[PDB]
Design a binder for this molecule. Sequence first.
Ligand SMILES: Cc1cc2nc3c(=O)[nH]c(=O)nc-3n(C[C@H](O)[C@H](O)[C@H](O)COP(=O)(O)O)c2cc1C
Ligand SMILES: Cc1cc2nc3c(=O)[nH]c(=O)nc-3n(C[C@H](O)[C@H](O)[C@H](O)COP(=O)(O)O)c2cc1C
Ligand code: SF4
Ligand code: SF4
Ligand code: FES
Ligand code: FES
Ligand SMILES: [Cl-]
Ligand code: NA
Ligand code: NA
Ligand code: NA
Ligand code: NA
Ligand code: NA
Ligand code: NA
Ligand code: NA
Ligand code: NA
Lengths: 418, 418, 155, 156
Amino acid sequence: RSYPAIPRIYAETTLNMLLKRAKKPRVHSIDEYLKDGGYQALEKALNMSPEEIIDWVDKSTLRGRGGAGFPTGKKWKFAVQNPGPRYFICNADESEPGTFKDRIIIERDPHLLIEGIIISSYAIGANEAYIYIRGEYPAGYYILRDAIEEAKKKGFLGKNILGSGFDLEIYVARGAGAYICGEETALIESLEGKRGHPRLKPPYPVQKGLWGKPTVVNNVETIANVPFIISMGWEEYRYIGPSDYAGPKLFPVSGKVKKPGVYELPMNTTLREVIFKYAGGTLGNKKVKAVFSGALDCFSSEELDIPMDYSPLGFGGTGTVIVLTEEDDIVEAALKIAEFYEHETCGQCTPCRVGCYEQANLLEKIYKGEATEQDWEGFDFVNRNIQPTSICGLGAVAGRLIRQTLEKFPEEWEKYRK
Amino acid sequence: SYPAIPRIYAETTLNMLLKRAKKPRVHSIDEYLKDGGYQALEKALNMSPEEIIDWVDKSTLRGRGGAGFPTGKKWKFAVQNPGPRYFICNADESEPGTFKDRIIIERDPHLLIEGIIISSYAIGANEAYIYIRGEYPAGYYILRDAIEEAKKKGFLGKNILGSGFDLEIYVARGAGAYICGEETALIESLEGKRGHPRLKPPYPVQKGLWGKPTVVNNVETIANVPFIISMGWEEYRYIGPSDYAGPKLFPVSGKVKKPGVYELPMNTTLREVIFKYAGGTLGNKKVKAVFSGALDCFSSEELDIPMDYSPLGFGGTGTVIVLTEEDDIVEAALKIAEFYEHETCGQCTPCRVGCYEQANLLEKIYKGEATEQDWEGFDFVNRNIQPTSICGLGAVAGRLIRQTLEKFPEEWEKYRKK
Amino acid sequence: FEFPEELKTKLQEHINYFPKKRQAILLCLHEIQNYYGYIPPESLKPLADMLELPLNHVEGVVAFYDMFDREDKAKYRIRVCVSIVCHLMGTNKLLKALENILGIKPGEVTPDGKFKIVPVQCLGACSEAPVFMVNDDEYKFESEVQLNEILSRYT
Amino acid sequence: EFEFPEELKTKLQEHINYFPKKRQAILLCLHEIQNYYGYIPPESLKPLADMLELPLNHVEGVVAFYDMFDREDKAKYRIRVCVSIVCHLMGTNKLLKALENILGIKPGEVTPDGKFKIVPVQCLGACSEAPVFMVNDDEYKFESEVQLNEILSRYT
Ligand SMILES: Cc1cc2nc3c(=O)[nH]c(=O)nc-3n(C[C@H](O)[C@H](O)[C@H](O)COP(=O)(O)O)c2cc1C
Ligand SMILES: Cc1cc2nc3c(=O)[nH]c(=O)nc-3n(C[C@H](O)[C@H](O)[C@H](O)COP(=O)(O)O)c2cc1C
Ligand code: SF4
Ligand code: SF4
Ligand code: FES
Ligand code: FES
Ligand SMILES: [Cl-]
Ligand code: NA
Ligand code: NA
Ligand code: NA
Ligand code: NA
Ligand code: NA
Ligand code: NA
Ligand code: NA
Ligand code: NA
């Protein structure tokens, strides 16, 4: 079974969990997964009550890996307080600039994700689950379809799984080019066969989701932790990394580093360690100027000693690390972030629709040296006014990184204004 | 960081094997990829092993480790025998004057690695070795690192680029024995034993490592394989004379102005190598002789020969050691005798005793301490090293020295007077 | 306008795959684009019928989702990432190489209808910047010589 | 009982696990031992034989066979001097004289501090850069006594 060409992203782990197989850049099929003890966490889970699985996942302190860090167990608990039927959704839309951590699980160790989906579905009483994978991951789509068939043949999916009385089918849906379809409610709209337009939240999907039914949406990486939590127990899982923010975490590192790729590391690792200890330091040993946390935040070279955790002073986000060095023009980089938001607003909300557009249009004039005084003042105003009335996170953050560059790199911006 | 290596001069008229290795530094995988590296492997993996064998056969590539056996034919002999099969790259390069292979290893390791992978695929070997002499520590570390890069990029390991072809390359080190360049002694050494040549036949392609079909090829031979696949066998065969086609490396040393490695077509003459490429002689002194490593001695009357594998050509490995008019031929012969004394493995009686006595007696002659019986003994010994020999060393230990006795009788006769 | 049987069969498989027919809309549109080299405007009124959806629903979905193209037929879509990391690491070198080899710029189709360059947002392979796809195949761009050889595999 | 320090033992195991069969690692292990100790200690061969699952006389025969290994003399730095044809023609004897001037020793000898041993070797495969020597893994062309003195000053 041949697949489309995929570039061979470098992957390194100090924990040997999520990347025990995915550190090798190829598809690991079900026999190889089984030889490594795979699906024995599922078997164990089916001998447990759903309520006990939720409890372990709660006690593990697992938090959402899709960017917001919501406690996973708490999320599941909320879903099961509502009458069924319920649905489970794996979010594989991964489209934020700099972020490529989820695809290496999907493309190299799909059974880790499948096993996590089955356990999670059982935990919340869902008999129908979905993977929503972005359209620009065609190989991941075919790999997952094939892996799901392998799992069916070995009796891990279908009716009455391993004699447990639990039924599950996993359907694989494809996106078709919209970053906003990673927002969980827009994702659900897309699964329902519509345009990807976020819904007002609350209600959260766990109350009202797919077809208005209780729905848990979790990120690929979040789900990939679930087999480990069942396999080793929650106590041992909490002994991974710092007691405060336990567990393995994937860090997709790119830009001006010697060893760009995905690193599996504990969350007490600092940003400086990620860059210098793990990713080989900078190209040309040039000084770090900035790190972009995807398209969300901009950290300066004075902020490299922060931990890669979900604490208030920590890196947070998805652990996406894009490294800019001393030669890299911050205004040019800010323009690329503005262009992303321009291209990805869904346009339901007026300040988001016109603000994302104007932010990019005006910043392009600034960059090219064609901005009037009014264009400069307009740019500053628009950047501060994308968020009002927004119903989803995109409008709330479309100006965030750019504002941070204005605050942290005033000298470079001032050169453009002159 | 790698151990210090002298910066051997390298020059090419063909820009193939020395396209990168003309610059005295390590070229890592990114530089190699920028030059189209590993695209030949990708092409090869879309071909049948049988077609690769056919291409290498029709290219006319001949062994570069000294004997000139047709490479495609060697592969064909291996694949007519049941597997598993092994592929060995011979990097033992220890003959006096010979330093051509190291510059590929140390400067363009990926060229060699790419060739090893293609060749292994062609013969159905899933395990390959490089056997590198112990006195090339930098080359060893460079290759170990380059193999790891190839693994990162998916050119080694299981299911290489989705082909279903598996390969690991292991790097072994020698430990001081020239005889471990003889392919059967090399295999004994890979098996953890002393480097004792085996009676052949059988040839390694019938019975080799662990008694299984094994292809041994020289570094330089293997480095041609990517070009044959990239260019096609017809275009490759267009390089140089149609009966001895392709690039050849010529390690030139001794009394020339520009000693180094020259990549040239095999219609080049020995005179051209010395005077057109290597800058002529030190002090513009007359050429007295050229030693083809420790194998042959050509006089100044023999410089118009082609640097090919023809009966009247230079042959060997194209190793060119230049002696000029004031260099004492008997002193030079003594150094050749000392080499064979040091390198006989001792299994065969005439080789064991003959290599020792040839050097022992020639030392006496050189120092003016030889009796009449020592002179007569020396002549007899020189003619009687080969009988019962099981490998090429015993067959050639007297060859160069005999040629000096025939071509420079006047100089020898001066040692007879004293 | 009528879908040929082999395509109509594949569409039916998608429609039968999910619990509700309308969930198959994106898989169907990908299939149509794969088949024709674009989304024929005339294909939408028979597709809506198969999905039991109004035509304007289907039109609205085609317009929303950036991967779909109703304007230009092309055998091979060369998707070039223009987002931050690829920009930093050499998008412009990749585009210059493509123009040197193919004679076209982003948004353009070669006169033979063989290649279209499509500028896209981050492809999720940023460590391999600058990234491009050729239809479903994805690659790191290293150099013009390397790219020329890659492109020659598409005939 | 002689035992390998843990840090050496670890490296030896890595070699033993590297190849498909344990006995293939014998030379890499012997290199590692000589690196660590400055020579091959006679007492080190049994433990190594046990680790390779080989008879001791097999290991002893291998050490005897391979010229890079030295069971006699401990030296921190091995100065390998090529004595083959091309280096001979181009100035091996000048290099040996320079080494005697700087270090007070001749081929086969160790300095009284155990720091340097001169080891005469066959062709090192750098003949265009004759006369050639190595200092442990580093390899150089000899140009002159002043140059050699500067090179040797880097090894402390
Ligand atoms: C604009 C936008 C884009 C998002 N993209 C993704 C995405 O690609 N993948 C993802 O898992 N979550 C994404 N999210 C977050 C999801 O809405 C949601 O919080 C997440 O899928 C929940 O799973 P988790 O709790 O396991 O993180 C995005 C949110 C927004 C506002
Ligand atoms: C004493 C002796 C030493 C040899 N040394 C080498 C050597 O260092 N490298 C080499 O590739 N072949 C060497 N050979 C030749 C090999 O036995 C063999 O022919 C060769 O590795 C086959 O590869 P080829 O066909 O690519 O030349 C030596 C042969 C003998 C007799
Ligand atoms: S905030 Fe922006 S992206 Fe989110 S729903 Fe409103 S217009 Fe759409
Ligand atoms: S001919 Fe000489 S080197 Fe070859 S096996 Fe016999 S003794 Fe050993
Ligand atoms: S920025 Fe181009 S692949 Fe992510
Ligand atoms: S003769 Fe000394 S390095 Fe070759
Ligand atoms: Cl076969
Ligand atoms: Na299978
Ligand atoms: Na079981
Ligand atoms: Na991948
Ligand atoms: Na269902
Ligand atoms: Na099923
Ligand atoms: Na079923
Ligand atoms: Na070199
Ligand atoms: Na663009």
